[PDB]
Structure formats: structure tokens, C-alpha cells
Design a protein around this ligand. Structure first.
Ligand SMILES: Nc1nc2c(ncn2[C@@H]2O[C@H](COP(=O)(O)OP(=O)(O)O)[C@@H](O)[C@H]2O)c(=O)[nH]1
Length: 330
């Protein structure tokens, strides 16, 4: 392989007594709007380049999974009111109340066969499904459907959250979060600064593809942010990687939502292929120094480990082929 040969022409470890034991380092900054997938990418590095999440670890996320599910159903139910949606069967109107009774009596996330029932019956309702399917009209968790459909398993008294349950969680992050992991004998120091560094090695910029029909426009606020980044002088010598994330939700959304909601001038077919290609182009086009700087775009499903591993392996080769010389030995 070419990246292997590239690595091989370095002579800097020879300048260190025990240089063959030295640590080559890669400072990687993770950027993107809130909920673009940054924290999930961080968890996937744990999962892929470390042990991941142990049973004991996953167990710590149970109330978060419960918290997420609860918030998800309450958001849909509360939406029905503002959107004026009727329950498919008006018996549900009594469970809706029960949801607020059970939720309104706890400080923390929980699950009971009782609550499980109320939520199952509500989720199964046509009117609720009608509200759910109109989610671009209100604030709703991305994993809402994921959890809601697996209620039975999640509800089980002796339920243990899977790694995926852990990756699907929405957790309030505050501050920079730094993760260290080794991949290909490269010691990465990964920094997630939150959607809210003059010489970083590479930058992975996350974009939630599914935010397109969310109705300044969401997609455009991310475009505005990516413009600032890839064009910033500090990042001139930094590998700019673009993760057009949530391709799974976008694949299912573009089916019934037109890209024109986001890009009014879009005239291509409303297909996953053309619509996604358009978005990439829209972003890579913000690059001023095209002659000089290249943007590395990858369509990702951050909650899909295989995809993230595949994509990260690719991302990593680009760093070796393009930035190793700027990478220090410690
Ligand atoms: N379906 C799907 N959900 C995703 C994807 N990436 C992240 N998520 C979910 O989006 C939510 C917010 O992502 P998170 O990593 O917390 O975003 P951050 O605010 O950028 O850190 C969580 O529920 C994640 O599990 C993706 O590609 N597909």
C-alpha cells in the first residue's frame, strides 16, 4: 500500500534514542452543529479502537435510554396538540394523560410495565404515527423511532442496553471532550468542542443530512459554519474531512421530502443519489482555495460501527499520506 510506503520514508525516529518506541501523534478536532453526530463518532472510536462499552458500562446508560424514550414520546404527543392531530382511537387520550402522570412524578428516567404499556399503545396509534411522520414540523429525537420500536426489549425488567442502545443516546455534552486512541500506530488526541487549534492535524466536520427539511435554515447554518472552517487561515495545512452524517435518516426522508425545501433552486430528481450528491457539491463548493485545498467527504451513519470503521480507516490513510510530516513524536 501507498500509505505504508509513505510512512516508511520518514527518518525522524532515528533522531531519538529509543525512537522506535516513540509515539507519533495526530491532533484531530471534531466540529459540526449540535446533534450532527460528533459524540457518536467519539463513542465509535471507543468501540472500534478500544474495548468499547462493557456490560457494566452499558448498564450506566439505562436511565438515559429511558429518559430518551420518554422525552421522545412526550414530544410526539405534545406535538399532536400544537399540530391538531387526533388520536386514531380516543382511548389513547387517557394514556396520554397517564404518560404525563407517570413522567410528572419522577425526577429521573425510568421504565415500568405500566409506563411501557402506555407508551406501546400510544406509539402503535395511527394518530400518533401520523404525528410522528410529521416530525420535521417539531423538535423530536432522531432515535425516537429506534427506541420506541424496541420498547418491549427496553422495558424488560432485567434489560441491559446494547452498544447500539448506547450509541443511539442523546447525552448533554458540555465543554471540550478529549479522547485518546491508537489506530495504525498513530496516537490520536480527538477533541469534540460542541456545536456551540491553529495547527490541528485534521478536522472532521459533521453535517446532519436529515436536517434539510427541518422547517435561518438548518442546512444553511451548517454551510455557513463549514465555510468559515475550511476557509480559515489556521486550517490551511490541516486535512479537512467532511462527514455528511445521518445518511440513513436522509435516505428515508428524501423519499417523501423534497430537497427543494432546503435548496429551492434544486432541480435534480428527488432521489437519494442526486439529492445527496447535490448537498456534497453545495458544501465542497464553499472552499475558496480549491486549487490548493481538497475536502474529504464521506457519507456516514455515525451509529453504524462498520461504516464508521470503514470511513475512519479511509480518513486515517489521508492523514498519513498528507500530514504525517506535520505529526510529532512524543
Ligand atoms: N440515525 C442516526 N442517528 C445518528 C447518527 N449520528 C448520530 N445520531 C444520533 O443523533 C443524536 C445526536 O448525535 P450526537 O452524537 O449526540 O450529536 P452531537 O451533538 O454532534 O454530539 C443521537 O441520538 C445519535 O445517536 C446517524 O448517522 N444516524
Amino acid at each position: 500500500d501507498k500509505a505504508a510506503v509513505e510512512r516508511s520514508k520518514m527518518i525522524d525516529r532515528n533522531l531519538r534514542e529509543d525512537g522506535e518506541k516513540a509515539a507519533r501523534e495526530v491532533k484531530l478536532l471534531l466540529l459540526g452543529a449540535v446533534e450532527s453526530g460528533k459524540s457518536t463518532i467519539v463513542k465509535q472510536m471507543k468501540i472500534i479502537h478500544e474495548a468499547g462499552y462493557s456490560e457494566e458500562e452499558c448498564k450506566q446508560y439505562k436511565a438515559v435510554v429511558y429518559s430518551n424514550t420518554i422525552q421522545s414520546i412526550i414530544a410526539i404527543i405534545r406535538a399532536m396538540g400544537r399540530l391538531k392531530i387526533d388520536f386514531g382511537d380516543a382511548a389513547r387520550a387517557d394514556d396520554a394523560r397517564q404518560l404525563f402522570v407517570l413522567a410528572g412524578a419522577a425526577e429521573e428516567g425510568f421504565m415500568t410495565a405500566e409506563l411501557a404499556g402506555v407508551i406501546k399503545r400510544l406509539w402503535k396509534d395511527s394518530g400518533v404515527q401520523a404525528c410522528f411522520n410529521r416530525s420535521r414540523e417539531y423538535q423530536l429525537n432522531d432515535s425516537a423511532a429506534y427506541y420506541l420500536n424496541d420498547l418491549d426489549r427496553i422495558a424488560q425488567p432485567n434489560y441491559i442496553p446494547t452498544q447500539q442502545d448506547v450509541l443511539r443516546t442523546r447525552v448533554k455534552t458540555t465543554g471540550i471532550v478529549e479522547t485518546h486512541f491508537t489506530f495504525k500506530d498513530l496516537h490520536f488526541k480527538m477533541f469534540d468542542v460542541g456545536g456551540q487549534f491553529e495547527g490541528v492535524t485534521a478536522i472532521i466536520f459533521c453535517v446532519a443530512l436529515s436536517d434539510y427539511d427541518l422547517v435561518m435554515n438548518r442546512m444553511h447554518e451548517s454551510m455557513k459554519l463549514f465555510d468559515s472552517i475550511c476557509n480559515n487561515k489556521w486550517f490551511t495545512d490541516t486535512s479537512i474531512i467532511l462527514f455528511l452524517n445521518k445518511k440513513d435518516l436522509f435516505e428515508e426522508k428524501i423519499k417523501k421530502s423534497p430537497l427543494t425545501i432546503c435548496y429551492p433552486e434544486y432541480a435534480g430528481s428527488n432521489t437519494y443519489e442526486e439529492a445527496a450528491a447535490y448537498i456534497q457539491c453545495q458544501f465542497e463548493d464553499l472552499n475558496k482555495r480549491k486549487d490548493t485545498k481538497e475536502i474529504y467527504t464521506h457519507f456516514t451513519c455515525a451509529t453504524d460501527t462498520k461504516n464508521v470503521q470503514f470511513v475512519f480507516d479511509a480518513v486515517t490513510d489521508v492523514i498519513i499520506k498528507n500530514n504525517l510530516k506535520d505529526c510529532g513524536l512524543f
